[PDB]
Design a protein around this ligand. Sequence first.
Ligand SMILES: *[C@@H]1O[C@H](CO)[C@@H](O[C@@H]2O[C@H](CO)[C@@H](O[C@@H]3O[C@H](CO)[C@@H](O)[C@H](O[C@H]4O[C@H](CO)[C@@H](O)[C@H](O)[C@@H]4O)[C@@H]3O)[C@H](O)[C@H]2NC(C)=O)[C@H](O)[C@H]1NC(C)=O
Ligand SMILES: *[C@@H]1O[C@H](CO)[C@@H](O[C@@H]2O[C@H](CO)[C@@H](O[C@@H]3O[C@H](CO)[C@@H](O)[C@H](O)[C@@H]3O)[C@H](O)[C@H]2NC(C)=O)[C@H](O)[C@H]1NC(C)=O
Ligand SMILES: *[C@@H]1O[C@H](CO)[C@@H](O[C@@H]2O[C@H](CO)[C@@H](O[C@@H]3O[C@H](CO)[C@@H](O)[C@H](O)[C@@H]3O)[C@H](O)[C@H]2NC(C)=O)[C@H](O)[C@H]1NC(C)=O
Ligand SMILES: *[C@@H]1O[C@H](CO)[C@@H](O[C@@H]2O[C@H](CO)[C@@H](O[C@@H]3O[C@H](CO)[C@@H](O)[C@H](O)[C@@H]3O)[C@H](O)[C@H]2NC(C)=O)[C@H](O)[C@H]1NC(C)=O
Ligand SMILES: *[C@@H]1O[C@H](CO[C@@H]2O[C@@H](C)[C@@H](O)[C@@H](O)[C@@H]2O)[C@@H](O[C@@H]2O[C@H](CO)[C@@H](O)[C@H](O)[C@H]2NC(C)=O)[C@H](O)[C@H]1NC(C)=O
Ligand SMILES: CC(C)[C@@H](C)[C@@H](O)[C@H](O)[C@@H](C)[C@H]1CC[C@H]2[C@@H]3COC(=O)[C@H]4C[C@H](O)[C@H](O)C[C@]4(C)[C@H]3CC[C@]12C
Ligand SMILES: *[C@@H]1O[C@H](CO)[C@@H](O[C@@H]2O[C@H](CO)[C@@H](O)[C@H](O)[C@H]2NC(C)=O)[C@H](O)[C@H]1NC(C)=O
Ligand SMILES: *[C@@H]1O[C@H](CO)[C@@H](O[C@@H]2O[C@H](CO)[C@@H](O)[C@H](O)[C@H]2NC(C)=O)[C@H](O)[C@H]1NC(C)=O
Ligand SMILES: *[C@@H]1O[C@H](CO)[C@@H](O[C@@H]2O[C@H](CO)[C@@H](O)[C@H](O)[C@H]2NC(C)=O)[C@H](O)[C@H]1NC(C)=O
Ligand SMILES: *[C@@H]1O[C@H](CO)[C@@H](O[C@@H]2O[C@H](CO)[C@@H](O)[C@H](O)[C@H]2NC(C)=O)[C@H](O)[C@H]1NC(C)=O
Ligand SMILES: *[C@@H]1O[C@H](CO)[C@@H](O)[C@H](O)[C@H]1NC(C)=O
Ligand SMILES: *[C@@H]1O[C@H](CO)[C@@H](O)[C@H](O)[C@H]1NC(C)=O
Length: 742
Amino acid sequence: QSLYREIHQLISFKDVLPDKNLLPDWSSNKNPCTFDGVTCRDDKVTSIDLSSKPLNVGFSAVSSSLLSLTGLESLFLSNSHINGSVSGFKCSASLTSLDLSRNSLSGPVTTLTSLGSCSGLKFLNVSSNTLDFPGKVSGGLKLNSLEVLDLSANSISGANVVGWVLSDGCGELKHLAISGNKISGDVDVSRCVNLEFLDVSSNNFSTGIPFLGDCSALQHLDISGNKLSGDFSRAISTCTELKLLNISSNQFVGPIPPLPLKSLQYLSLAENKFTGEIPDFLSGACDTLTGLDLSGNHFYGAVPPFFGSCSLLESLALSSNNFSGELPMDTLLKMRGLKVLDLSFNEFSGELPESLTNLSASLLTLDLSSNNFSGPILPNLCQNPKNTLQELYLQNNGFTGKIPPTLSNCSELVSLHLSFNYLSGTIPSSLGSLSKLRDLKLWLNMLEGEIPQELMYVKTLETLILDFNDLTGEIPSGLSNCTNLNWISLSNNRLTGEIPKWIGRLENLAILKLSNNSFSGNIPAELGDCRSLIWLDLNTNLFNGTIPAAMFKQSGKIAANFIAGKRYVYIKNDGMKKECHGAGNLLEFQGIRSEQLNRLSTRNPCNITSRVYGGHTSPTFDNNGSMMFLDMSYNMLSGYIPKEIGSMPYLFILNLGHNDISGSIPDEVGDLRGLNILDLSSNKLDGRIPQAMSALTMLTEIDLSNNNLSGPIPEMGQFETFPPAKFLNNPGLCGYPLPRCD
Ligand SMILES: *[C@@H]1O[C@H](CO)[C@@H](O[C@@H]2O[C@H](CO)[C@@H](O[C@@H]3O[C@H](CO)[C@@H](O)[C@H](O[C@H]4O[C@H](CO)[C@@H](O)[C@H](O)[C@@H]4O)[C@@H]3O)[C@H](O)[C@H]2NC(C)=O)[C@H](O)[C@H]1NC(C)=O
Ligand SMILES: *[C@@H]1O[C@H](CO)[C@@H](O[C@@H]2O[C@H](CO)[C@@H](O[C@@H]3O[C@H](CO)[C@@H](O)[C@H](O)[C@@H]3O)[C@H](O)[C@H]2NC(C)=O)[C@H](O)[C@H]1NC(C)=O
Ligand SMILES: *[C@@H]1O[C@H](CO)[C@@H](O[C@@H]2O[C@H](CO)[C@@H](O[C@@H]3O[C@H](CO)[C@@H](O)[C@H](O)[C@@H]3O)[C@H](O)[C@H]2NC(C)=O)[C@H](O)[C@H]1NC(C)=O
Ligand SMILES: *[C@@H]1O[C@H](CO)[C@@H](O[C@@H]2O[C@H](CO)[C@@H](O[C@@H]3O[C@H](CO)[C@@H](O)[C@H](O)[C@@H]3O)[C@H](O)[C@H]2NC(C)=O)[C@H](O)[C@H]1NC(C)=O
Ligand SMILES: *[C@@H]1O[C@H](CO[C@@H]2O[C@@H](C)[C@@H](O)[C@@H](O)[C@@H]2O)[C@@H](O[C@@H]2O[C@H](CO)[C@@H](O)[C@H](O)[C@H]2NC(C)=O)[C@H](O)[C@H]1NC(C)=O
Ligand SMILES: CC(C)[C@@H](C)[C@@H](O)[C@H](O)[C@@H](C)[C@H]1CC[C@H]2[C@@H]3COC(=O)[C@H]4C[C@H](O)[C@H](O)C[C@]4(C)[C@H]3CC[C@]12C
Ligand SMILES: *[C@@H]1O[C@H](CO)[C@@H](O[C@@H]2O[C@H](CO)[C@@H](O)[C@H](O)[C@H]2NC(C)=O)[C@H](O)[C@H]1NC(C)=O
Ligand SMILES: *[C@@H]1O[C@H](CO)[C@@H](O[C@@H]2O[C@H](CO)[C@@H](O)[C@H](O)[C@H]2NC(C)=O)[C@H](O)[C@H]1NC(C)=O
Ligand SMILES: *[C@@H]1O[C@H](CO)[C@@H](O[C@@H]2O[C@H](CO)[C@@H](O)[C@H](O)[C@H]2NC(C)=O)[C@H](O)[C@H]1NC(C)=O
Ligand SMILES: *[C@@H]1O[C@H](CO)[C@@H](O[C@@H]2O[C@H](CO)[C@@H](O)[C@H](O)[C@H]2NC(C)=O)[C@H](O)[C@H]1NC(C)=O
Ligand SMILES: *[C@@H]1O[C@H](CO)[C@@H](O)[C@H](O)[C@H]1NC(C)=O
Ligand SMILES: *[C@@H]1O[C@H](CO)[C@@H](O)[C@H](O)[C@H]1NC(C)=O
């Protein structure tokens, strides 16, 4: 046996794969110690790693072939497209680690009890599978030799499952993760005297806090992501060695209870309902504290002063509370090690004390957004050379004055967010010297001047958001270089010129919003060479010419992906203030408060109060793909609607109102089976509403008023839902909701 067995066992596995090419250098009459994925010691196989290879075989193929291999010590099959479920099998006494994570194992978690045939198994990872819990609890896992067990991200829903895992003993257990399930009930790890790591986060625990007993070895405790309301302080009081405590995203209330700080490195109480003010007793942790997160509560007060002793604190998150007072920098500068600072969403007032520039060479993220500050953006900022700052967020404050050009000295800057302020002046050209910047956001300020040509010197830029400023001039040609741009927005400015034809060279452009400006010219067919475009808002401009049929070629071959994951707001235009134009205004909204959109009142006649949608971007498709949004109302368009208009299936919205468009509504509009909004009012359209539109099943708003249209209204579909107003000022038109055809 020995070799003969080793090779015949491995090739038998290979020979059951559906794609034997996945193990190309495995072969007969050749030593396995030369195989990719194999590890050998002294010419004997000791480990097999076939992770991230789509083997597409059942576990039964693994147990008989690989797990029975004599002398095998570890098997790694993570993300290897193994399905089926565990059953009994001869398991060599040498196997100590099995990793079956990110696979499709199924069935009750009681299947795992048969892994007890591996007398030496100490590390089991079956996370990110689909194991469920038998409706009823019974027996135990009965793998009481394990030191490490990860059951996370399965489909386990039940009560006292934790009790089940540990029923028959846990003396040896050192690491237990069960996050990402729907487990509820009680957690009693008091008999697991060696437990050092407990992750019961993102579960369905809503009763009591886990019982930890002596807690004489616990170093990592993560109970975040539940609905826990209780007295965790009592439960963790005896925990002498705790290094990390994450209780975020729960239902905890009240002031900060006492804690064991003698070894605490990370502490998060975020996303609860704690009240009060940072107690002084927390100073005892500054000897060891590396990360603090108090964000998302109801705390108040000012950054207490003892934080100077927190020399080790690498990150301070205090956002979304009721903190106040000038920047307590008298303390911050003592934080030699601080690298992330986040005071956003408080009421820290006053100006920026000039001594900030020192901390700009140790920090990597500075977030003062959505506060009450006022005063100039310190020009001397980033004077201390070797400025490592990567992100600057000062939006939604009371900051006034010119945009400092010194900001070009933060050579490592990747995101600059100064929106929602009262910043006057021009946009510094030195920002072009920010060779790594990806996000420039300065909308709703008082920024005069033209858009710097020097932005061509930024080969990384991705987003350029400058709405609601006093910008003037034309679109700088230099942006043809920013190949990676995916989100340009210049609305509510006084820009002029024409949409440059080189707009098509940006194969990453997903969003282009240019409303309430003084642009002009025929719309460019080149926009049809934008393979990422899903959002094109051109309303309230002076464009003219007819509509290029060629701007709809990419429909069907779009893949929107670069765009997903950014906080936004969509403001639906109410059909009330005729002074307000467009379907709606989509706007980036990272770090700004929804409660400050009223600042637009003096800049926009739209009654925003009614409609404000938001969230984080989540494109609907991935391949396939087509434009989702398309607004061009309140321009000087004319000619006939190209029948290519109806080639965008994922299209939600379509506004072509208040123009000079004629011809007959193409019968392709009925093909837009995702259409929720359709505006074509105030035009010169003739013909009949194509009965093909009766196939539109998702129309929530339609408007065809003020045209030369004639004939019947489709009695099928949704046209009977809509009111006469949406069909008025069309003499020939008849049919309910209009009068019957005489
Ligand atoms: C059970 O298996 C699962 C699935 O493998 C496993 O969960 C995964 O753990 C890894 C780390 O072990 C996670 O990936 C890490 O994630 C963060 C960013 O999210 C990074 O810190 C890590 O990158 C570091 O390491 C890289 C090389 O190793 C470096 O290039 C890099 O600079 C960083 O230093 C790393 O990517 C992963 O997200 C999870 N979850 C998944 C994949 O769903 C789990 O740990 C296993 N359990 C046990 C007990 O081993
Ligand atoms: C997370 O845990 C909570 C409580 O720990 C679970 O909520 C409870 O779920 C049960 C099981 O479905 C509900 O029972 C059902 O209730 C109604 C009457 O309320 C009745 O029609 C059914 O016969 C059934 O017994 C129970 O009401 C519910 N209790 C609550 C919400 O207070 C919850 O389901 C768990 N999972 C999730 C995903 O939240
Ligand atoms: C402390 O606890 C918090 C809350 O549990 C941890 O933040 C959480 O981090 C996880 C990944 O570890 C995030 O999960 C992912 O989230 C998205 C939803 O946005 C989802 O698509 C994925 O399925 C995935 O689960 C989770 O969002 C995030 N939660 C929050 C509120 O930010 C944090 O990492 C913990 N820190 C430590 C040091 O333990
Ligand atoms: C296109 O952009 C321009 C410039 O932002 C908008 O003009 C300005 O619009 C706002 C919104 O209504 C006006 O503010 C209002 O002013 C009056 C008195 O001035 C006051 O009673 C209201 O409470 C409100 O503050 C602003 O005056 C107005 N002025 C000028 C001179 O342009 C325009 O409305 C935008 N159009 C669209 C459709 O968004
Ligand atoms: C589209 O408009 C351009 C530009 O005209 C100017 O801007 C318009 C929005 C409108 O306000 C006009 O009164 C402006 O003059 C037209 O191109 C020429 O524009 C020049 C002035 O720049 C004018 O002397 C010419 O007569 C215009 N037209 C021609 C054929 O020479 C353009 O014609 C307009 N229409 C189309 C279909 O392109
Ligand atoms: C790509 C991303 C940057 C992001 C914009 C999208 O990913 C976003 O999520 C989408 C799919 C959102 C934004 C605005 C929302 C519309 C609100 O404006 C209405 O008036 C209603 C009317 C009606 O309620 C119907 O549901 C549709 C519609 C147009 C809403 C639909 C979903 C939205 C379209
Ligand atoms: C495990 O996964 C495989 C696919 O990876 C499943 O087998 C396939 O089942 C479909 C059903 O139509 C067939 O068309 C495929 O040809 C099958 N694959 C083959 C024969 O290689 C299998 O059913 C899954 N389930 C289990 C329990 O293993
Ligand atoms: C908590 O937020 C409240 C508002 O909800 C703040 O109240 C105002 O704070 C300013 C600060 O300059 C005072 O001038 C106002 O007088 C306060 N309002 C009232 C009605 O008195 C408050 O500052 C925050 N609380 C703390 C403790 O910082
Ligand atoms: C950081 O700021 C300093 C001071 O403003 C800059 O130093 C000057 O840089 C310019 C660049 O053209 C040189 O011509 C000057 O000679 C420099 N100073 C002196 C005294 O000669 C420095 O360039 C900035 N660094 C950046 C933006 O990376
Ligand atoms: C920015 O774009 C311009 C064109 O708009 C680039 O001009 C290039 O010049 C080089 C020689 O320096 C030529 O080989 C290229 O053909 C030109 N065009 C392109 C698209 O590369 C300019 O180099 C670009 N770069 C910067 C830093 O401005
Ligand atoms: C915010 O700043 C303004 C002046 O800009 C001041 O009147 C106000 O009291 C400050 N505090 C709050 C909580 O808004
Ligand atoms: C604007 O919003 C207010 C909020 O109360 C609403 O009552 C009012 O009718 C709206 N006005 C228009 C013109 O839409």
